[PDB]
Protein backbone atom coordinates (compact mmCIF):
# COMPACT_ATOMS: atom_id res chain seq x y z
CA UNK A 1 0.00 0.00 0.00
CA UNK A 2 1.29 3.56 -0.77
CA UNK A 3 0.19 6.46 1.53
CA UNK A 4 0.51 10.10 0.36
CA UNK A 5 1.05 13.47 2.13
CA UNK A 6 -0.94 16.76 1.75
CA UNK A 7 1.72 18.15 -0.64
CA UNK A 8 1.15 15.33 -3.18
CA UNK A 9 -2.62 16.12 -3.36
CA UNK A 10 -2.04 19.90 -3.49
CA UNK A 11 0.49 19.72 -6.39
CA UNK A 12 -1.72 17.24 -8.24
CA UNK A 13 -4.80 19.58 -7.94
CA UNK A 14 -3.33 23.09 -8.49
CA UNK A 15 -2.57 23.73 -12.20
CA UNK A 16 -0.88 27.10 -11.37
CA UNK A 17 1.98 25.30 -9.46
CA UNK A 18 5.22 24.29 -11.35
CA UNK A 19 5.18 20.73 -9.78
CA UNK A 20 1.57 20.11 -11.05
CA UNK A 21 2.28 18.15 -14.28
CA UNK A 22 4.46 15.52 -12.49
CA UNK A 23 2.11 15.26 -9.45
CA UNK A 24 -1.14 15.00 -11.46
CA UNK A 25 0.38 12.17 -13.51
CA UNK A 26 1.67 10.40 -10.41
CA UNK A 27 -1.66 10.69 -8.59
CA UNK A 28 -3.70 9.38 -11.54
CA UNK A 29 -1.26 6.43 -11.85
CA UNK A 30 -1.38 5.61 -8.07
CA UNK A 31 -5.20 5.98 -7.99
CA UNK A 32 -5.76 3.56 -10.94
CA UNK A 33 -2.94 1.10 -9.89
CA UNK A 34 -3.23 -2.37 -8.30
CA UNK A 35 -1.56 -1.27 -5.06
CA UNK A 36 -4.00 0.44 -2.68
CA UNK A 37 -3.49 4.20 -2.37
CA UNK A 38 -3.92 4.91 1.36
CA UNK A 39 -5.45 8.33 2.10
CA UNK A 40 -5.40 9.35 5.77
CA UNK A 41 -8.43 11.39 6.91
CA UNK A 42 -5.92 13.99 8.27
CA UNK A 43 -4.31 14.15 4.76
CA UNK A 44 -7.69 14.65 3.02
CA UNK A 45 -8.65 17.26 5.65
CA UNK A 46 -5.15 18.91 5.30
CA UNK A 47 -5.49 19.16 1.49
CA UNK A 48 -8.88 20.95 1.84
CA UNK A 49 -7.48 23.29 4.50
CA UNK A 50 -4.42 24.21 2.33
CA UNK A 51 -6.14 24.69 -1.12
CA UNK A 52 -9.05 26.74 0.36
CA UNK A 53 -6.63 28.82 2.51
CA UNK A 54 -6.28 32.61 1.82
CA UNK A 55 -2.82 32.68 3.50
CA UNK A 56 -1.49 29.94 1.10
CA UNK A 57 -2.94 30.99 -2.31
CA UNK A 58 -3.81 34.39 -3.82
CA UNK A 59 -6.91 32.71 -5.38
CA UNK A 60 -7.95 29.85 -3.03
CA UNK A 61 -9.78 26.77 -4.36
CA UNK A 62 -13.51 26.85 -3.41
CA UNK A 63 -14.48 24.44 -0.56
CA UNK A 64 -17.10 23.01 -3.01
CA UNK A 65 -14.26 22.37 -5.55
CA UNK A 66 -11.94 21.00 -2.82
CA UNK A 67 -14.62 18.55 -1.56
CA UNK A 68 -15.48 17.38 -5.13
CA UNK A 69 -11.73 16.66 -5.75
CA UNK A 70 -11.59 14.58 -2.52
CA UNK A 71 -14.83 12.79 -3.52
CA UNK A 72 -13.49 11.92 -7.03
CA UNK A 73 -10.16 10.61 -5.62
CA UNK A 74 -11.96 8.46 -2.96
CA UNK A 75 -14.05 7.11 -5.92
CA UNK A 76 -10.78 5.85 -7.62
CA UNK A 77 -10.39 2.02 -7.74
CA UNK A 78 -7.08 2.00 -5.72
CA UNK A 79 -8.17 4.65 -3.17
CA UNK A 80 -8.75 3.57 0.45
CA UNK A 81 -9.59 6.18 3.12
CA UNK A 82 -7.63 5.48 6.34
CA UNK A 83 -8.91 6.34 9.86
CA UNK A 84 -6.38 6.13 12.73
CA UNK A 85 -6.14 2.49 13.89
CA UNK A 86 -6.04 1.35 17.51
CA UNK A 87 -2.36 0.80 16.49
CA UNK A 88 -2.13 4.42 15.16
CA UNK A 89 -1.69 6.02 18.63
CA UNK A 90 1.13 3.58 19.62
CA UNK A 91 2.73 3.97 16.16
CA UNK A 92 2.59 7.82 16.56
CA UNK A 93 4.16 7.59 20.06
CA UNK A 94 6.94 5.26 18.80
CA UNK A 95 7.78 7.61 15.88
CA UNK A 96 7.77 10.68 18.19
CA UNK A 97 10.00 8.85 20.73
CA UNK A 98 12.39 7.76 17.95
CA UNK A 99 13.21 11.43 16.97
CA UNK A 100 12.55 13.17 20.37
CA UNK A 101 9.87 14.99 18.29
CA UNK A 102 9.06 18.65 19.15
CA UNK A 103 6.88 21.38 17.55
CA UNK A 104 5.89 20.46 13.95
CA UNK A 105 7.80 17.09 14.16
CA UNK A 106 4.79 15.88 16.24
CA UNK A 107 2.45 16.72 13.29
CA UNK A 108 4.79 14.75 10.95
CA UNK A 109 4.92 11.82 13.42
CA UNK A 110 1.11 11.79 13.53
CA UNK A 111 0.90 11.66 9.66
CA UNK A 112 3.80 9.11 9.51
CA UNK A 113 1.89 6.81 11.93
CA UNK A 114 -0.72 6.02 9.25
CA UNK A 115 2.04 4.55 6.98
CA UNK A 116 3.82 2.70 9.84
CA UNK A 117 0.60 1.09 11.18
CA UNK A 118 -0.19 -0.25 7.62
CA UNK A 119 3.50 -1.09 6.83
CA UNK A 120 2.88 1.25 3.84
CA UNK A 121 5.34 3.40 1.87
CA UNK A 122 4.96 7.10 2.85
CA UNK A 123 5.32 9.46 -0.10
CA UNK A 124 6.01 13.08 0.80
CA UNK A 125 7.70 16.11 -0.83
CA UNK A 126 8.99 16.95 2.68
CA UNK A 127 12.45 15.34 3.06
CA UNK A 128 12.23 15.83 6.87
CA UNK A 129 10.43 12.41 6.80
CA UNK A 130 13.99 10.99 6.30
CA UNK A 131 14.27 11.59 10.11
CA UNK A 132 11.99 8.56 10.87
CA UNK A 133 14.36 5.58 10.35
CA UNK A 134 11.50 3.19 11.24
CA UNK A 135 9.28 4.88 8.55
CA UNK A 136 9.42 3.72 4.91
CA UNK A 137 9.48 7.14 3.12
CA UNK A 138 10.14 7.90 -0.56
CA UNK A 139 10.12 11.14 -2.60
CA UNK A 140 6.82 11.00 -4.66
CA UNK A 141 8.78 11.66 -7.92
CA UNK A 142 11.38 8.92 -7.04
CA UNK B 1 -19.17 13.94 28.15
CA UNK B 2 -17.03 17.12 27.85
CA UNK B 3 -14.40 17.45 25.09
CA UNK B 4 -11.59 20.05 25.40
CA UNK B 5 -9.49 21.94 22.79
CA UNK B 6 -5.65 22.20 22.65
CA UNK B 7 -5.75 25.74 24.17
CA UNK B 8 -7.42 24.37 27.34
CA UNK B 9 -4.55 21.82 27.79
CA UNK B 10 -1.91 24.43 26.86
CA UNK B 11 -3.21 27.04 29.38
CA UNK B 12 -3.48 24.30 32.04
CA UNK B 13 0.21 23.31 31.65
CA UNK B 14 2.03 26.63 31.03
CA UNK B 15 2.65 28.35 34.43
CA UNK B 16 4.04 31.41 32.54
CA UNK B 17 0.65 32.08 30.77
CA UNK B 18 -1.90 34.43 32.51
CA UNK B 19 -4.87 32.00 32.09
CA UNK B 20 -2.96 29.18 33.85
CA UNK B 21 -4.45 29.19 37.37
CA UNK B 22 -8.03 29.16 35.97
CA UNK B 23 -7.27 26.51 33.30
CA UNK B 24 -5.29 24.31 35.72
CA UNK B 25 -8.19 24.17 38.22
CA UNK B 26 -10.76 23.53 35.49
CA UNK B 27 -8.65 20.75 33.94
CA UNK B 28 -8.09 19.11 37.33
CA UNK B 29 -11.87 19.35 38.05
CA UNK B 30 -12.74 17.85 34.61
CA UNK B 31 -10.14 15.05 34.96
CA UNK B 32 -11.47 13.88 38.39
CA UNK B 33 -15.22 14.49 37.63
CA UNK B 34 -17.76 11.68 36.87
CA UNK B 35 -18.69 13.05 33.38
CA UNK B 36 -16.06 11.65 30.97
CA UNK B 37 -13.36 14.10 29.81
CA UNK B 38 -12.98 13.31 26.14
CA UNK B 39 -9.51 13.99 24.77
CA UNK B 40 -9.19 13.53 20.99
CA UNK B 41 -5.84 12.02 19.85
CA UNK B 42 -5.54 15.15 17.59
CA UNK B 43 -5.96 17.43 20.69
CA UNK B 44 -3.34 15.42 22.68
CA UNK B 45 -0.99 15.55 19.68
CA UNK B 46 -1.74 19.30 19.25
CA UNK B 47 -0.90 20.06 22.91
CA UNK B 48 2.54 18.36 22.59
CA UNK B 49 3.13 20.18 19.30
CA UNK B 50 2.36 23.64 20.82
CA UNK B 51 4.11 23.24 24.26
CA UNK B 52 7.35 21.91 22.67
CA UNK B 53 7.28 24.51 19.83
CA UNK B 54 10.32 26.88 19.54
CA UNK B 55 8.31 29.58 17.66
CA UNK B 56 5.49 29.46 20.28
CA UNK B 57 7.54 29.66 23.51
CA UNK B 58 10.90 31.26 24.36
CA UNK B 59 11.66 28.14 26.47
CA UNK B 60 9.59 25.22 25.05
CA UNK B 61 8.42 22.49 27.38
CA UNK B 62 10.57 19.35 26.80
CA UNK B 63 8.91 16.49 24.77
CA UNK B 64 9.76 14.19 27.73
CA UNK B 65 7.89 16.64 30.00
CA UNK B 66 5.06 17.06 27.43
CA UNK B 67 4.48 13.28 27.08
CA UNK B 68 4.63 12.76 30.90
CA UNK B 69 1.92 15.44 31.27
CA UNK B 70 -0.19 13.66 28.59
CA UNK B 71 0.41 10.27 30.31
CA UNK B 72 -0.55 11.84 33.66
CA UNK B 73 -3.80 13.29 32.21
CA UNK B 74 -4.68 9.89 30.66
CA UNK B 75 -4.12 8.25 34.12
CA UNK B 76 -6.87 10.53 35.62
CA UNK B 77 -10.22 8.74 36.36
CA UNK B 78 -12.55 10.84 34.04
CA UNK B 79 -10.10 11.05 31.15
CA UNK B 80 -10.89 9.05 27.99
CA UNK B 81 -8.64 9.29 24.91
CA UNK B 82 -10.89 9.47 21.81
CA UNK B 83 -10.10 8.04 18.37
CA UNK B 84 -12.34 9.12 15.43
CA UNK B 85 -15.40 6.80 15.36
CA UNK B 86 -17.19 5.37 12.29
CA UNK B 87 -19.37 8.57 12.05
CA UNK B 88 -16.47 11.04 12.56
CA UNK B 89 -15.77 11.58 8.81
CA UNK B 90 -19.47 12.30 7.95
CA UNK B 91 -19.81 14.55 11.06
CA UNK B 92 -16.67 16.50 9.94
CA UNK B 93 -18.19 16.88 6.42
CA UNK B 94 -21.55 18.05 7.88
CA UNK B 95 -19.89 20.69 10.12
CA UNK B 96 -17.69 21.96 7.22
CA UNK B 97 -20.76 22.03 4.89
CA UNK B 98 -22.79 23.83 7.59
CA UNK B 99 -20.37 26.84 7.66
CA UNK B 100 -18.89 26.67 4.08
CA UNK B 101 -15.58 26.00 5.92
CA UNK B 102 -12.33 27.22 4.30
CA UNK B 103 -8.70 27.31 5.53
CA UNK B 104 -8.43 26.87 9.36
CA UNK B 105 -12.26 26.36 9.55
CA UNK B 106 -11.49 22.84 8.20
CA UNK B 107 -9.17 22.13 11.19
CA UNK B 108 -11.86 23.44 13.61
CA UNK B 109 -14.53 21.28 11.89
CA UNK B 110 -12.33 18.15 12.15
CA UNK B 111 -11.81 18.78 15.94
CA UNK B 112 -15.51 19.71 16.49
CA UNK B 113 -16.48 16.41 14.80
CA UNK B 114 -15.10 14.47 17.82
CA UNK B 115 -17.68 16.28 20.04
CA UNK B 116 -20.58 16.00 17.52
CA UNK B 117 -20.01 12.24 16.98
CA UNK B 118 -19.96 11.64 20.77
CA UNK B 119 -22.84 14.17 21.37
CA UNK B 120 -20.31 15.86 23.75
CA UNK B 121 -19.99 19.51 24.85
CA UNK B 122 -17.02 21.14 23.08
CA UNK B 123 -15.10 23.42 25.46
CA UNK B 124 -12.89 25.91 23.64
CA UNK B 125 -11.46 29.37 24.45
CA UNK B 126 -12.20 30.27 20.79
CA UNK B 127 -15.70 31.90 20.47
CA UNK B 128 -15.74 31.18 16.68
CA UNK B 129 -16.98 27.63 17.57
CA UNK B 130 -20.44 29.29 18.06
CA UNK B 131 -20.62 29.32 14.18
CA UNK B 132 -21.24 25.53 14.29
CA UNK B 133 -24.96 25.59 15.25
CA UNK B 134 -25.02 21.72 15.29
CA UNK B 135 -22.14 21.70 17.88
CA UNK B 136 -22.80 22.13 21.61
CA UNK B 137 -19.94 24.56 22.44
CA UNK B 138 -19.25 26.41 25.73
CA UNK B 139 -16.31 28.66 26.73
CA UNK B 140 -14.25 26.59 29.25
CA UNK B 141 -14.32 29.22 32.09
CA UNK B 142 -18.19 29.52 31.77
Amino acid sequence: MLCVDVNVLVYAHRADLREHADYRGLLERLANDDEPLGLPDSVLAGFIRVVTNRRVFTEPTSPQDAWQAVDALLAAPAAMRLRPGERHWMAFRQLASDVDANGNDIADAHLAAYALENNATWLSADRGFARFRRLRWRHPLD
Amino acid sequence: MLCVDVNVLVYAHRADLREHADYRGLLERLANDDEPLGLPDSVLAGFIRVVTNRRVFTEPTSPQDAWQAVDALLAAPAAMRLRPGERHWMAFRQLASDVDANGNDIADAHLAAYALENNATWLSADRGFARFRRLRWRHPLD
Binding site: V6, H13, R14, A15, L17, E28, V56, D65, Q68, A79 | -
Partner: peptide, 28 residues
Protein backbone atom coordinates in the same frame (compact mmCIF):
# COMPACT_ATOMS: atom_id res chain seq x y z
CA UNK C 1 -9.88 8.19 -12.25
CA UNK C 2 -8.68 11.52 -13.75
CA UNK C 3 -7.66 14.59 -11.70
CA UNK C 4 -9.82 17.58 -12.68
CA UNK C 5 -7.16 20.39 -12.43
CA UNK C 6 -8.09 23.78 -10.93
CA UNK C 7 -6.51 27.04 -9.78
CA UNK C 8 -4.77 30.19 -10.96
CA UNK C 9 -2.55 33.02 -9.60
CA UNK C 10 0.01 30.98 -7.59
CA UNK C 11 1.10 31.06 -3.88
CA UNK C 12 1.15 33.99 -1.43
CA UNK C 13 4.74 35.32 -0.95
CA UNK C 14 7.03 33.37 1.43
CA UNK C 15 4.82 30.24 1.37
CA UNK C 16 6.45 26.87 0.56
CA UNK C 17 4.08 23.84 0.16
CA UNK C 18 7.07 21.42 0.42
CA UNK C 19 7.64 22.05 4.22
CA UNK C 20 4.78 21.06 6.58
CA UNK C 21 6.31 23.24 9.34
CA UNK C 22 6.52 26.38 7.11
CA UNK C 23 3.00 25.85 5.68
CA UNK C 24 1.70 25.39 9.23
CA UNK C 25 3.35 28.66 10.30
CA UNK C 26 1.90 30.54 7.27
CA UNK C 27 -1.66 29.25 7.85
CA UNK C 28 -1.45 29.93 11.67
Amino acid sequence: YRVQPSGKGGLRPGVDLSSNAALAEAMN
